[PDB]
Amino acid sequence: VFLGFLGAAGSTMGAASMTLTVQARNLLSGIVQLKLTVWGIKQLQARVLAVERYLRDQQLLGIWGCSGKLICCTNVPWNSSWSNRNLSEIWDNMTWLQWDKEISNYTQIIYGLLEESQNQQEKNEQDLLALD
Amino acid sequence: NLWVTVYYGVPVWKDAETTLFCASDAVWATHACVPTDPNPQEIHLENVTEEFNMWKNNMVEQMHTDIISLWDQSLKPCVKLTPLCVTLQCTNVTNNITDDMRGELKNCSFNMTTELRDKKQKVYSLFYRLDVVQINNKEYRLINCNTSAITQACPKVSFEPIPIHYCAPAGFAILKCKDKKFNGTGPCPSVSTVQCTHGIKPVVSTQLLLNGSLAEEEVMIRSENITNNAKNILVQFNTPVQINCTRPNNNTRKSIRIGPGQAFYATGDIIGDIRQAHCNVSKATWNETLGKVVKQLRKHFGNNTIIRFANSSGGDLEVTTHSFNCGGEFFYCNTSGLFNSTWISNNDSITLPCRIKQIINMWQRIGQAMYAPPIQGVIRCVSNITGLILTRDTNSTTETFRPGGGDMRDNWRSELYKYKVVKIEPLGVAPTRCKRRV
Amino acid sequence: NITDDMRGELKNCSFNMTTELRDKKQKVYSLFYRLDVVQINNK
Numbered sequence: 001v002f003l004g005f006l007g008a009a010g011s012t013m014g015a016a017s018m019t020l021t022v023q024a025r026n027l028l029s030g031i032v033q034l035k036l037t038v039w040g041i042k043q044l045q046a047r048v049l050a051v052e053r054y055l056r057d058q059q060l061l062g063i064w065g066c067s068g069k070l071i072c073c074t075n076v077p078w079n080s081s082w083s084n085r086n087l088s089e090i091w092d093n094m095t096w097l098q099w100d101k102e103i104s105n106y107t108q109i110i111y112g113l114l115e116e117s118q119n120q121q122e123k124n125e126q127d128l129l130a131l132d
Numbered sequence: 133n134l135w136v137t138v139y140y141g142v143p144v145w146k147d148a149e150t151t152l153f154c155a156s157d158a159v160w161a162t163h164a165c166v167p168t169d170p171n172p173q174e175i176h177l178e179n180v181t182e183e184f185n186m187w188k189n190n191m192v193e194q195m196h197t198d199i200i201s202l203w204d205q206s207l208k209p210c211v212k213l214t215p216l217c218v219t220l221q222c223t224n225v226t227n228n229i230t231d232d233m234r235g236e237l238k239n240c241s242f243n244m245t246t247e248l249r250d251k252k253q254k255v256y257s258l259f260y261r262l263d264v265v266q267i268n269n270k271e272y273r274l275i276n277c278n279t280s281a282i283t284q285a286c287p288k289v290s291f292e293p294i295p296i297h298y299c300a301p302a303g304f305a306i307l308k309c310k311d312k313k314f315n316g317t318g319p320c321p322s323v324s325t326v327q328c329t330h331g332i333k334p335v336v337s338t339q340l341l342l343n344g345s346l347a348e349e350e351v352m353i354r355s356e357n358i359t360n361n362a363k364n365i366l367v368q369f370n371t372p373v374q375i376n377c378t379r380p381n382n383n384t385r386k387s388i389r390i391g392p393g394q395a396f397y398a399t400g401d402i403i404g405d406i407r408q409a410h411c412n413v414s415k416a417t418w419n420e421t422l423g424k425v426v427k428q429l430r431k432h433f434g435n436n437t438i439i440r441f442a443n444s445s446g447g448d449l450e451v452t453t454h455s456f457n458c459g460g461e462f463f464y465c466n467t468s469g470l471f472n473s474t475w476i477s478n479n480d481s482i483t484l485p486c487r488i489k490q491i492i493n494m495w496q497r498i499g500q501a502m503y504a505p506p507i508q509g510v511i512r513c514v515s516n517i518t519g520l521i522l523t524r525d526t527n528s529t530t531e532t533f534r535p536g537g538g539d540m541r542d543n544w545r546s547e548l549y550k551y552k553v554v555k556i557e558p559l560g561v562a563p564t565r566c567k568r569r570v
Numbered sequence: 571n572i573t574d575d576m577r578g579e580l581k582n583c584s585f586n587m588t589t590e591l592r593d594k595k596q597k598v599y600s601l602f603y604r605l606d607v608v609q610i611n612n613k
């Protein structure tokens with residue numbers, strides 16, 4: 001069922017995952033459509049910042065070997081120190097906003113391993129499987 | 133065991149400021165602006181709650197400075213009135229004897245430089261005594277000439293407030309609470325979101341708020357700090373209070389070619405119903421609404437206190453009286469006729485005397501000034517009073533309140549409190565039972 | 571200070587200056603360095 005932009009924002013993370021694309025589209029949006037003038041360089045600046053805003057994180061997903069995004073798995077195990085809750089305590093009983101409230105503390109820390117571990121090791125390995 | 137799983141398109145956001153841009157339909161300053169959608173979208177968000185804070189909402193700051201920028205840009209390509217700064221030879225104007233009008237204008241004459249830079253021309257024009265001042269018939273001076281230069285507003289451009297919509301760029305969301313209750317800040321049980329804001333007219337006024345939005349339920353009292361009388365109070369009405377203001381002067385525009393090339397619009401002759409401009413207010417309506425306001429006040433000060441209303445502390449006319457624009461003309465009205473009452477412990481119509489100025493200073497800004505051209509013919513208009521800008525004045529019962537203003541960011545804030553801007557963060561991660569194979 | 575070690579270097583110049591009252595002018599004065607000004611053609 002089509003809910004609308006951010007229509008699942010007020011639901012559990014499990015439920016919300018159903019309709020990530022409805023949001024995804026408008027993360028970059030597009031369209032929009034005497035010189036200078038007020039707004040003359042503001043629509044300019046804003047529309048630029050939108051593009052940068054998008055790609056800055058998209059590239060990270062490019063690095064984190066997935067690309068086929070919205071959702072993908074890794075080979076990095078979850079450290080229990082990063083909010084030790086059960087799946088039903090998390091996915092079936094918590095919104096994404098509530099999630100960030102806690103996990104945001106380890107953002108860069110988790111990014112470390114995502115930015116690396118697998119990306120490093122998945123490769124070489126393959127290069128070696130190509131030996132024969 | 134659980135693993136790190138990567139998610140994208142996550143419905144989360146952080147409070148953040150970015151560069152907003154306008155939209156409005158397809159006069160004032162708006163043309164270079166993206167047309168609005170024929171179907172503005174929205175969506176109520178169920179289970180979503182969070183805090184608002186109108187007192188730190190930087191949307192106001194941007195809007196304020198943007199409007200200022202627009203103002204200047206609309207004047208640069210217009211005619212400068214630099215050579216008007218000359219000694220004026222002025223005399224009283226014999227209005228219908230004896231003297232009810234008090235003159236208020238002088239039949240000034242002066243040697244003016246014309247298109248023929250060389251031979252000058254003795255001309256005349258009617259000026260308000262609020263615009264000119266005696267030097268040292270008698271000699272007079274345009275008041276602006278002691279502070280800065282003055283520019284004539286183009287006769288083609290208008291000042292009619294036009295509904296403007298604000299939009300955020302992709303990655304940013306416009307959040308809008310629909311909660312009829314709001315203290316000025318805190319959590320809202322009922323939050324929605326929109327593509328863009330509703331049309332807001334850039335109405336400049338002091339003391340009284342005009343042509344704004346209406347409140348639901350009861351009268352709304354909002355203040356950064358009610359107990360702190362160094363702050364002020366925003367009052368939003370529930371029902372439009374009609375005010376009808378008139379300038380009964382079918383006057384002409386003896387335009388004078390003080391070139392070269394560029395033309396000046398002087399004041400011709402004043403004929404017709406020589407009465408002072410004034411405003412008409414429905415008295416019973418005012419009394420009724422004021423009472424509703426006092427009810428609120430009772431609710432934040434006690435069920436055994438006394439409420440008195442009075443005029444300002446005086447001083448700068450711009451703050452002392454109610455200033456507003458109608459059709460290009462600038463009015464200054466004595467709101468003592470409104471703000472003069474009291475309430476205990478637990479037609480009819482009102483006439484408000486007004487004055488007309490032609491030299492004005494916007495947004496408390498010094499260093500420049502703008503000359504309003506006289507508008508030909510009788511000028512009369514009507515608007516909706518939709519709120520008050522009040523200030524809080526042996527402190528155990530009787531309290532006195534009075535009208536203020538000055539800082540016009542207050543006006544924008546009186547509307548934008550319904551909105552806030554947040555930055556979406558699409559990228560998130562979470563623990564999920566999944567080990568990824570090659 | 572007599573006699574003359576400073577060599578002057580500045581002149582006590584005066585002139586009919588246009589003021590805010592574009593019309594009646596005002597005789598004023600100002601000290602200028604002789605590196606800034608040059609004789610035309612007191613002088």
Ligand SMILES: *[C@@H]1O[C@H](CO)[C@@H](O[C@@H]2O[C@H](CO)[C@@H](O[C@@H]3O[C@H](CO[C@H]4O[C@H](CO)[C@@H](O)[C@H](O[C@H]5O[C@H](CO)[C@@H](O)[C@H](O)[C@@H]5O)[C@@H]4O)[C@@H](O)[C@H](O[C@H]4O[C@H](CO)[C@@H](O)[C@H](O)[C@@H]4O[C@H]4O[C@H](CO)[C@@H](O)[C@H](O)[C@@H]4O)[C@@H]3O)[C@H](O)[C@H]2NC(C)=O)[C@H](O)[C@H]1NC(C)=O
Pocket residue numbers: 292293342343456457458459508509513514515516
């Ligand atoms: C709170 O909100 C309210 C509601 O919005 C505001 O109230 C409005 O205030 C504005 C002024 O700010 C008023 O605008 C005036 O409207 C006049 C009426 O025009 C209509 O009737 C005439 C007469 O038959 C028709 O010809 C018109 O039709 C045409 O125009 C429309 C729109 O462009 C077109 O779509 C049509 O196709 C027609 O072409 C209208 O139906 C209007 O006459 C008047 O315009 C004159 O004055 C302006 C300056 O104000 C001049 O720039 C302009 O040139 C006009 O002057 C000519 O006509 C007069 C007539 O006597 C002559 O004297 C002049 O010499 C000259 O020839 C103006 O646009 C509006 O009426 C009013 N609305 C309401 C609901 O009452 C409040 O302003 C606001 N409060 C505050 C604080 O601002």
Ligand SMILES: *[C@@H]1O[C@H](CO)[C@@H](O[C@@H]2O[C@H](CO)[C@@H](O[C@@H]3O[C@H](CO)[C@@H](O)[C@H](O)[C@@H]3O)[C@H](O)[C@H]2NC(C)=O)[C@H](O)[C@H]1NC(C)=O
Pocket residue numbers: 007008009010011012015178179
């Ligand atoms: C908004 O939050 C409310 C809770 O505050 C969520 O309410 C849940 O709504 C659904 C739909 O009405 C209910 O699900 C239905 O429950 C019955 C019985 O359990 C089951 O037979 C149906 O198959 C269905 O699941 C759910 O019980 C109800 N929860 C509670 C606490 O009453 C709603 O889901 C929230 N919306 C968002 C987008 O998260």
Ligand SMILES: *[C@@H]1O[C@H](CO)[C@@H](O[C@@H]2O[C@H](CO)[C@@H](O[C@@H]3O[C@H](CO)[C@@H](O)[C@H](O)[C@@H]3O)[C@H](O)[C@H]2NC(C)=O)[C@H](O)[C@H]1NC(C)=O
Pocket residue numbers: 221242243252253254
């Ligand atoms: C511009 O208007 C001014 C008045 O606002 C006119 O001023 C007049 O200027 C002349 C020349 O300076 C004065 O004339 C001289 O007066 C003295 C004494 O009366 C007389 O001795 C001289 O022979 C001569 O006439 C005149 O008095 C002065 N008027 C006043 C009111 O001070 C000026 O003429 C105007 N220019 C134009 C083009 O009309």
Ligand SMILES: *[C@@H]1O[C@H](CO)[C@@H](O[C@@H]2O[C@H](CO)[C@@H](O[C@@H]3O[C@H](CO)[C@@H](O)[C@H](O)[C@@H]3O)[C@H](O)[C@H]2NC(C)=O)[C@H](O)[C@H]1NC(C)=O
Pocket residue numbers: 223224225226239240241255256257
């Ligand atoms: C305001 O001052 C102006 C001058 O700055 C006065 O202008 C005078 O206005 C009257 C009426 O338009 C003119 O009178 C008419 O002149 C013609 C020709 O001389 C004559 O045929 C008519 O019988 C009539 O008198 C007068 O000439 C004009 N003066 C000039 C200098 O143009 C006006 O009177 C002043 N108003 C006040 C209340 O004093």
Ligand SMILES: *[C@@H]1O[C@H](CO)[C@@H](O[C@@H]2O[C@H](CO)[C@@H](O[C@@H]3O[C@H](CO)[C@@H](O)[C@H](O)[C@@H]3O)[C@H](O)[C@H]2NC(C)=O)[C@H](O)[C@H]1NC(C)=O
Pocket residue numbers: 357359360361362
């Ligand atoms: C709302 O703003 C008002 C004023 O802007 C704040 O009032 C201030 O409240 C404190 C606590 O009652 C007063 O501090 C006390 O003052 C006495 C004398 O100066 C001193 O002896 C104490 O050590 C203490 O500092 C303060 O004077 C009072 N200010 C005024 C103008 O009366 C109130 O705190 C504000 N509320 C919010 C939430 O910030």
Ligand SMILES: *[C@@H]1O[C@H](CO)[C@@H](O[C@@H]2O[C@H](CO)[C@@H](O[C@@H]3O[C@H](CO)[C@@H](O)[C@H](O)[C@@H]3O)[C@H](O)[C@H]2NC(C)=O)[C@H](O)[C@H]1NC(C)=O
Pocket residue numbers: 443444445446452453468
């Ligand atoms: C608002 O209305 C009040 C009256 O309700 C006006 O009060 C007047 O305020 C001025 C300034 O404080 C007082 O003027 C001063 O009076 C003393 C003595 O007469 C004199 O020595 C000073 O030179 C000066 O004029 C005035 O007396 C006071 N009137 C009364 C009845 O107390 C105030 O002017 C009003 N504001 C507006 C904008 O009209």
Ligand SMILES: *[C@@H]1O[C@H](CO)[C@@H](O[C@@H]2O[C@H](CO)[C@@H](O[C@@H]3O[C@H](CO)[C@@H](O)[C@H](O)[C@@H]3O)[C@H](O)[C@H]2NC(C)=O)[C@H](O)[C@H]1NC(C)=O
Pocket residue numbers: 466468469485
């Ligand atoms: C706004 O309108 C009010 C009337 O609605 C005007 O009130 C007048 O205010 C002045 C200053 O407070 C009063 O003048 C003082 O009166 C006493 C006694 O007559 C005299 O002793 C003082 O020397 C001084 O003139 C005046 O009486 C009062 N008028 C009435 C009807 O109470 C006020 O002037 C208006 N403001 C504007 C800008 O016109």
Ligand SMILES: *[C@@H]1O[C@H](CO)[C@@H](O[C@@H]2O[C@H](CO)[C@@H](O[C@@H]3O[C@H](CO)[C@@H](O)[C@H](O)[C@@H]3O)[C@H](O)[C@H]2NC(C)=O)[C@H](O)[C@H]1NC(C)=O
Pocket residue numbers: 585586595596597
């Ligand atoms: C501005 O300063 C200049 C000097 O730097 C003043 O010049 C004076 O101008 C008047 C008018 O051109 C001259 O007066 C005429 O002189 C002749 C001969 O002495 C006499 O025949 C006439 O009756 C008349 O007085 C005057 O000589 C000239 N001074 C010099 C030094 O050349 C001018 O007056 C100043 N303006 C202001 C407003 O003070």
Ligand SMILES: *[C@@H]1O[C@H](CO)[C@@H](O[C@@H]2O[C@H](CO)[C@@H](O[C@@H]3O[C@H](CO)[C@@H](O)[C@H](O)[C@@H]3O)[C@H](O)[C@H]2NC(C)=O)[C@H](O)[C@H]1NC(C)=O
Pocket residue numbers: 582583584598599600
């Ligand atoms: C530089 O030239 C200026 C004029 O451009 C000369 O100005 C003169 O300065 C003196 C000292 O400030 C003034 O003298 C005083 O005048 C008052 C009133 O006349 C008198 O009460 C005092 O006893 C004293 O004399 C003089 O008036 C002023 N002149 C003018 C035109 O304002 C200054 O003297 C020049 N310096 C050199 C070294 O020549």
Ligand SMILES: *[C@@H]1O[C@H](CO)[C@@H](O[C@@H]2O[C@H](CO)[C@@H](O)[C@H](O)[C@H]2NC(C)=O)[C@H](O)[C@H]1NC(C)=O
Pocket residue numbers: 079080081
């Ligand atoms: C999970 O990450 C935490 C840090 O977030 C690691 O914590 C270390 O734990 C050991 C054992 O208690 C201590 O010696 C270290 O000093 C802790 N580090 C800090 C920052 O407190 C823990 O090692 C991590 N587990 C995995 C498997 O790497």
Ligand SMILES: *[C@@H]1O[C@H](CO)[C@@H](O[C@@H]2O[C@H](CO)[C@@H](O)[C@H](O)[C@H]2NC(C)=O)[C@H](O)[C@H]1NC(C)=O
Pocket residue numbers: 224234235
């Ligand atoms: C113009 O008329 C005003 C009155 O409308 C006169 O005002 C007088 O001005 C003098 C000087 O300021 C005061 O001494 C009087 O008290 C003022 N009268 C009043 C009623 O306030 C002024 O004299 C008039 N000018 C002409 C040339 O007659």
Ligand SMILES: *[C@@H]1O[C@H](CO)[C@@H](O[C@@H]2O[C@H](CO)[C@@H](O)[C@H](O)[C@H]2NC(C)=O)[C@H](O)[C@H]1NC(C)=O
Pocket residue numbers: 265275278279
């Ligand atoms: C610039 O002119 C204004 C008047 O146009 C002068 O304002 C006066 O300022 C003093 C001091 O604040 C007040 O006593 C007067 O009441 C003011 N007059 C008015 C009309 O408000 C100001 O003094 C002038 N500046 C210069 C340098 O002369």
Ligand SMILES: *[C@@H]1O[C@H](CO)[C@@H](O[C@@H]2O[C@H](CO)[C@@H](O)[C@H](O)[C@H]2NC(C)=O)[C@H](O)[C@H]1NC(C)=O
Pocket residue numbers: 315316317318354355356357358
């Ligand atoms: C906005 O409402 C909040 C409550 O929702 C008010 O918070 C009170 O603030 C004062 C000052 O910090 C504290 O003394 C109270 O204990 C707070 N109340 C609670 C519930 O925490 C705040 O006063 C309100 N603002 C307006 C203008 O009324």
Ligand SMILES: *[C@@H]1O[C@H](CO)[C@@H](O[C@@H]2O[C@H](CO)[C@@H](O)[C@H](O)[C@H]2NC(C)=O)[C@H](O)[C@H]1NC(C)=O
Pocket residue numbers: 343346371372514515516
């Ligand atoms: C004054 O505000 C009232 C709202 O209280 C406006 O009322 C509208 O009036 C027109 C004409 O009767 C109707 O078409 C609308 O449906 C009314 N709105 C509602 C809420 O009832 C009126 O337009 C306002 N005037 C000004 C100039 O804006």
Ligand SMILES: *[C@@H]1O[C@H](CO)[C@@H](O[C@@H]2O[C@H](CO)[C@@H](O)[C@H](O)[C@H]2NC(C)=O)[C@H](O)[C@H]1NC(C)=O
Pocket residue numbers: 434435
């Ligand atoms: C002031 O007194 C009034 C009654 O005169 C009180 O009114 C109550 O207000 C609350 C909030 O609106 C309602 O829940 C009650 O039902 C009202 N009572 C009645 C009689 O209508 C109000 O509580 C009083 N304020 C103070 C501080 O005590």
Ligand SMILES: *[C@@H]1O[C@H](CO)[C@@H](O[C@@H]2O[C@H](CO)[C@@H](O)[C@H](O)[C@H]2NC(C)=O)[C@H](O)[C@H]1NC(C)=O
Pocket residue numbers: 468469472473
């Ligand atoms: C303030 O408004 C009151 C009315 O609300 C005005 O009261 C008048 O006061 C004078 C002096 O006491 C009496 O002559 C009138 O009869 C009073 N009117 C009534 C309705 O009682 C008072 O004039 C007002 N003040 C201002 C400055 O206008």
